[PDB]
């Protein structure tokens, strides 16, 4: 009702927004996007509360994503209207007149609710309460205050807080209330929830940010930090406070980096522009700390080292598929380094020689499915690879590709072997890729499969992605490469060489008393467990205790040492025997092993969420005796299928193997009774397991299964009889 004051609110808001702008220079040129202010803090915006009739330009609702079909565009919320207009506080804040009426209901309604609950003789519980958690002038939730029993003596408290202004040199706006007695008295969850919808939803906001560049799977599990940057106690205890003019800007580093595809716009900083001398990145105006942050990210010629990597790794496909296409040979031009950010024109990167002559389809997108019309054109085909660093205005990659293709081929600024070629385009700021140009049979789905592989596999992109992530200090909970899970298990028996690796019994330790009675701990011998599922081949490198001499204690380097042994093996093992995939039981081993195996990039490394019962197998006396009596490190080999594969299917033999070890884990000697039901049962002495017929194996398999399920029931405190055969199989295989 106080129209004079609403005008002041609009004034004050515009002033503070200008203060942010000057922190990014900008000065008089307008069209600065509103999204950076009002986006909630959890998405990395400033979280500004709005009290004016500001509106978003209709250009800012655009968003896009790439999938296997190619790119798809979206245009959030609008049917025709410009009416997206950044909610006022006032609609979401309840009038006093309603508060003073509602408090006569809820404090009476609660009183009835507990009275019947105590007549029900049970504790009032959160599901009864969430409908009226946040109501009443004394808020209902104040009854659950930590120290409520002692606050009942704090009389006079409103007088005291008003008088605090004569003692504390700060000033606080909540001089009339305190959360200890009144509760929170406002809530703006609803405000935040539809601020996002006003700006175009979560997927619409993130186009204005570098989020796509970091290549996280999804925006759910993300977390920020602000406790270990430069802003430590170092920053504040440092002498000479007048130094805070350069390093006064540096807390803003993260914010400027995060929002950079919309601060750096040509459409906003109208004026002269520059290109950062080792990159393709154009800059408009002098943003105070973006130039610093980019040079760090692309340190040590990363642009070329992305480019020439992708060139070689693409050629590696053509280095194998020689007979899949009408080509004789391919060549790598190894042309001068600076072309990777020579935007004015490009030469070809790769050259291909026909057997005779293909058909040339037509100049068309990578997504264009079909048809042919162009003349056959003998011998000469070429591809170019274009990197770029896009932003919000021009992150469309397919329009970019077709544009650059025409520009260079129509005039003499470029040399290519022939008109028959294509250029790939990759936007490193959003991880989009596409191509435009000429094609030939088979090549188009081949390039599709190749690029789809490259964008996740390539080491040089991994360097770039990790630097952006660590520079943003943005962390995630769930994302990894795909876990080994139950439904994958059939792929383990494919013709590829595959190893399991387990290290759980390396750094074992024994407590003992000293002769002085004080307690301490001794390390003992360990082993590295390595096993082949589709062949039964096992390796066992005994780690003798002496290797940790001097080190001892917490055994910190044990995981790193473990990777060294595995790498030493694989290096000396013949090339044809090398794994295609290594699967590791403990996720902590992944980073050590990866670093040591970079010389052999054919090796897939994969972590399991599905645990396996190998840990108990090393307590079998046939193995335990050997490890204890050993006095120097030495390798040992076993085949855990004694003779089974001569009649038994490998996955069924694997099933038997898993059953035995799991049973020994859960009930030990009782499983041995099933292994040894009469003392007159027999084995070869070389064998791990008794000599038995297939029927006799089937009999004990059922018995071991029934023990495992019974023990599963006992420790889950639940009936076993509801389980299906598939659920039984999953529990045996490792986890449901």
């Amino acid at each position: 009702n106080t129209q004079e004051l609403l005008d002041l609110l609009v004034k004050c808001e515009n002033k503070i927004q200008t203060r942010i702008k000057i922190g990014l220079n900008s000065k008089m040129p307008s069209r600065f996007p509103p999204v950076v202010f009002y986006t909630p803090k959890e998405l990395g915006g400033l979280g500004m509360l709005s009290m004016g009739h500001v509106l978003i330009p209709q250009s800012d609702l655009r968003w896009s994503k790439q999938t296997d079909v190619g790119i798809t565009h979206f245009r959030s919320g609008m049917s025709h209207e410009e009416d997206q207009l950044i909610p006022n506080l006032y609609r979401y804040i309840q009038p006093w007149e309603s508060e003073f009426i509602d408090s006569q209901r809820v404090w009476a309604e609660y009183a009835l609710k507990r009275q019947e609950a105590i007549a029900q003789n049970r504790r009032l519980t959160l599901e009864d309460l969430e409908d009226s958690w946040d109501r009443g002038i004394p808020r209902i939730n104040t009854l659950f205050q930590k120290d409520r029993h002692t606050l009942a003596y704090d009389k006079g408290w409103r007088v005291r807080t008003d008088f605090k202004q004569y003692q504390v040199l700060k000033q606080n706006p909540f001089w009339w209330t305190h959360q200890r007695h009144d509760g929170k008295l406002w809530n703006l969850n609803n405000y935040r929830t539809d601020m996002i919808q006003a700006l175009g939803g979560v997927e619409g906001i993130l186009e204005h940010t570098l989020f796509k560049g970091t290549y996280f799977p999804t925006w759910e599990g993300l977390f920020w930090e602000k406790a270990s940057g430069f802003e430590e106690s170092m920053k504040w205890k440092k002498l000479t406070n007048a130094q805070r003019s350069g390093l006064n800007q540096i807390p803003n580093r993260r914010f400027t980096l995060w929002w950079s595809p919309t601060i750096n716009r040509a459409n906003v900083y109208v004026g002269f522009q520059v290109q950062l001398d080792l990159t393709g990145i154009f800059m408009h105006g002098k943003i105070p700390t973006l130039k610093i942050s980019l040079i760090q990210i692309f340190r040590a010629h990363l642009w070329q080292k992305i480019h020439e990597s992708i060139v070689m790794d693409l050629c590696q496909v053509f280095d194998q598929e020689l007979d899949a296409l009408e080509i004789e040979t391919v060549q790598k031009e190894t042309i001068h380094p600076r072309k990777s950010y020579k935007m004015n024109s490009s030469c070809a990167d790769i050259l291909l020689f026909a057997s005779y002559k293909w058909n040339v389809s037509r100049p068309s997108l990578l997504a264009d499915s079909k048809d042919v019309m162009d003349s056959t054109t003998t011998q000469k085909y070429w591809i170019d690879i274009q990197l770029r660093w896009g932003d919000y205005d021009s992150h469309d990659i397919e329009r970019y590709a077709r544009a650059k293709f025409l520009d260079y081929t129509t005039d003499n600024m470029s040399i290519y072997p022939s008109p028959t070629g294509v250029l790939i385009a990759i936007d490193l700021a959003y991880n989009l890729h596409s191509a435009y140009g000429n094609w030939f049979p088979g090549s188009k789905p081949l390039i599709q499969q190749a690029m789809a592989k490259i964008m996740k596999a390539n080491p040089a992109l991994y360097v770039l992605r990790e630097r952006i992530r660590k520079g943003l200090q943005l962390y995630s909970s769930e994302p990894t490469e795909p876990y080994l899970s139950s439904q994958n298990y059939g792929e383990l028996f494919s013709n590829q060489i595959i190893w399991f690796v387990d290290d759980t019994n390396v750094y074992r330790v024994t407590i003992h008393k000293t002769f002085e009675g004080n307690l301490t701990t001794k390390p003992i011998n360990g082993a590295i467990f390595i096993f082949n599922p589709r062949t039964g081949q096992l390796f066992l490198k005994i780690i003798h205790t002496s290797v940790w001499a001097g080190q001892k204690r917490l055994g910190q380097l044990a995981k790193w040492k473990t990777a060294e042994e595995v790498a030493a093996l694989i290096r000396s093992l013949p090339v044809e025997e090398q794994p295609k995939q290594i699967i590791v039981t403990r996720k902590g081993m992944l980073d050590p092993l990866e670093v040591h195996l970079l010389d052999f990039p054919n090796i897939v490394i994969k972590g399991s969420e599905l645990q396996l019962p190998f840990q108990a197998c090393l307590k079998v006396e046939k193995f335990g005796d050997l490890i204890l009596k050993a006095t120097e490190p030495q390798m040992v080999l076993f085949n855990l299928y004694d003779d089974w594969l001569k009649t038994i299917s490998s996955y069924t033999a694997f099933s038997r193997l898993i059953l035995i070890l799991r049973a020994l884990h859960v009930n030990n000697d009782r499983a041995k009774v099933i292994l040894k039901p009469d003392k007159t049962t027999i084995t070869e002495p070389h064998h791990i397991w008794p000599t038995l017929t297939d029927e006799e194996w089937i009999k004990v398999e059922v018995q071991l299964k029934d023990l495992i399920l019974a023990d599963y029931g006992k420790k889950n405190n639940v009936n076993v009889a509801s389980l299906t055969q598939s659920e039984i199989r999953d529990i045996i295989l490792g986890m449901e």
Partner: peptide, 20 residues
């Protein structure tokens, strides 16, 4: 590095893994 094949009915000793 010493290896001790115990995969079955014979025991063999390699002294480097390239012999395997």
């Amino acid at each position: 590095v010493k290896v001790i094949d115990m995969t079955g009915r014979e025991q063999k000793v390699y002294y480097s893994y390239s012999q395997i």
